[PDB]
């Protein structure tokens, strides 16, 4: 039973002013809805489409293409660990193994209570500063397996 809220709708129409076409606001509109609800539900695809004046198959095409826009329910805190080449040399596999022991899940899966979802991600742009991970909008560098339980405790 999806409805666009009156503040999400005003935020989408705020960014339609900054482009020639309202089609250009589609990425930000998906991120606006996901920021409020954790993920983009199925009824939000038709909701965003009718506001922007583009077909729903165009909105769904964009949302499935982009990795960060989520079309499946996630946890309260998303853990995104780097698995690219410089983090592979600095020991990401030990970080991945420590994350799979504290959480008792596999990447792509959420925890049973729904607190955390574990996802691999590309290079975060922090390659010189060691193995890297992100929890929500927070970047943690110089990762060690011993640091994994204390770091996770902050996010409840």
């Amino acid at each position: 039973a999806f409805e666009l809220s009156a503040a999400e709708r005003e935020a989408i129409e705020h960014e339609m002013h900054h482009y020639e076409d309202p089609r250009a606001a589609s990425i930000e509109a998906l991120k606006i809805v996901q920021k409020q609800r954790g993920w983009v539900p199925d009824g939000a695809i038709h909701a965003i489409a009718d506001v922007l004046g583009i077909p729903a198959s165009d909105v769904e095409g964009v949302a499935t293409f982009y990795s960060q826009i989520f079309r499946q329910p996630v946890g309260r805190h998303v853990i995104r660990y780097c698995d690219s080449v410089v983090c592979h040399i600095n020991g990401y596999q030990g970080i991945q193994a420590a994350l799979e022991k504290k959480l008792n899940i596999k990447p792509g899966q959420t925890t049973f209570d729904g607190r955390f979802t574990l996802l691999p991600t590309c290079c975060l742009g922090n390659c010189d500063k060691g193995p890297n991970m992100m929890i929500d909008e927070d970047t943690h560098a110089h990762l060690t397996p011993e640091a994994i339980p204390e770091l996770l405790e902050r996010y409840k």
Binding site: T64, S67, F70, Q72, P107, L119
Partner: protein
């Protein structure tokens, strides 16, 4: 005494699970030089292609075996049995109930649907040979 490769009576065989092996692909009918095979495709509610009718005119048949080698399911095979004879030429026309035997014949183990991507009962998507599980476009993993 007949060798195993003897080209006598034409039968249709069955799967080791017990279903008819013919998927009504019509390759045997077109590869026959004499034009002695007629068949029509039917489809179950499960989605399995099977022949609605299968008709071989044995008066015209020359027992060349081009139908057997055309078949991509091993359903149609030529058996060592030459014992045929009739008073009427109309009784040389064999229907599917005169051709479908109880087992797999010369090739005991081959099942075509295990290879095929198409989904029928007992084999959903990703349950075929050398086939991975379907990944949805909405999946969180990149």
């Amino acid at each position: 005494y007949l060798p195993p490769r003897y080209r006598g009576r034409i039968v249709l065989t069955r799967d080791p699970d017990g279903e008819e092996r013919c998927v009504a692909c019509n390759l045997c009918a077109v590869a026959c030089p004499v034009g002695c095979i007629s068949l029509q495709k039917a489809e179950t509610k499960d989605g399995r292609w099977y022949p609605e009718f299968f008709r071989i005119n044995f008066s015209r048949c020359i027992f060349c075996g081009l139908c057997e080698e055309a078949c991509p399911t091993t359903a149609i095979q030529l058996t060592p049995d030459f014992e045929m004879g009739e008073y009427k030429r109309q009784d040389l026309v064999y229907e599917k109930e005169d051709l479908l035997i109880s087992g797999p014949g010369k090739y005991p183990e081959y099942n075509f649907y295990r290879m095929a991507g198409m989904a029928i009962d007992g084999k959903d998507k990703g349950e075929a040979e050398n086939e991975a599980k379907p990944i949805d476009v909405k999946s969180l993993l990149p």
